[PDB]
Amino acid sequence: AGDSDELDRLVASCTTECIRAKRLAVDYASHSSHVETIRDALHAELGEDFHPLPGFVPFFSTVTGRWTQPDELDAGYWYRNLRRTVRFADAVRALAEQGYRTFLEVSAHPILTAAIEEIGDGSGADLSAIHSLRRGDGSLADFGEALSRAFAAGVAVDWESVHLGTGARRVPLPTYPFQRERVWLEP
């Protein structure tokens, strides 16, 4: 992660070596030092009462490579998430060597595509890339216009609520056109 007028060099020096090179227009970024100049916003909004609360499913805190730590409850948690590097090489190596073989991405600007190629060089497959929201229904009549693009953006909707009642019935249709290539084993 580099400042403005720096990503240009970061991709110019990268395209000459014939490897993955991308740059984003986002003004903020995480796991790289920017929060080093702000220390009055990450440790001043905690007033947690001295009484117990319940929890939920465990999470894997990737802030120190293949960190076995589930979470860091320190006041510098946001700091290390925004400043300390994830060290994603070790993290994605541990993900691939175990069963974690689908990268269900949530943003349209992933920072693990390099990790995707790294895993492709080694063991592990099915490294996914799921996109964000592409609008959605206008209403129930303006329904279809942009919900067709919302479905076609990785966001599955509920189609039994679409046709809950419209006078629609089952119709035989051509199935999946299995793209066929010869895979034969000879004795």
Binding site: P172, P174, T175, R182, W184, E186
Partner: protein, 48 residues
């Protein structure tokens, strides 16, 4: 698909055409004038 199978049945078309060649079959030891030769088959086709 089942509709194509009905198209096959309705017009009385036989699917028995011949042996496959995509599978890398030898096809040359598969037959012999001697019916008892080991390695040889008897039918000269079949729907495949």
């Amino acid at each position: 698909t089942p509709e194509e199978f009905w198209e096959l049945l309705s017009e009385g078309r036989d699917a028995v055409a011949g042996l496959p060649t995509d599978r890398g079959w030898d096809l040359d030891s598969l037959f012999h004038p001697d019916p008892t030769r080991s390695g040889t088959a008897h039918q000269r086709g079949g729907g495949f």
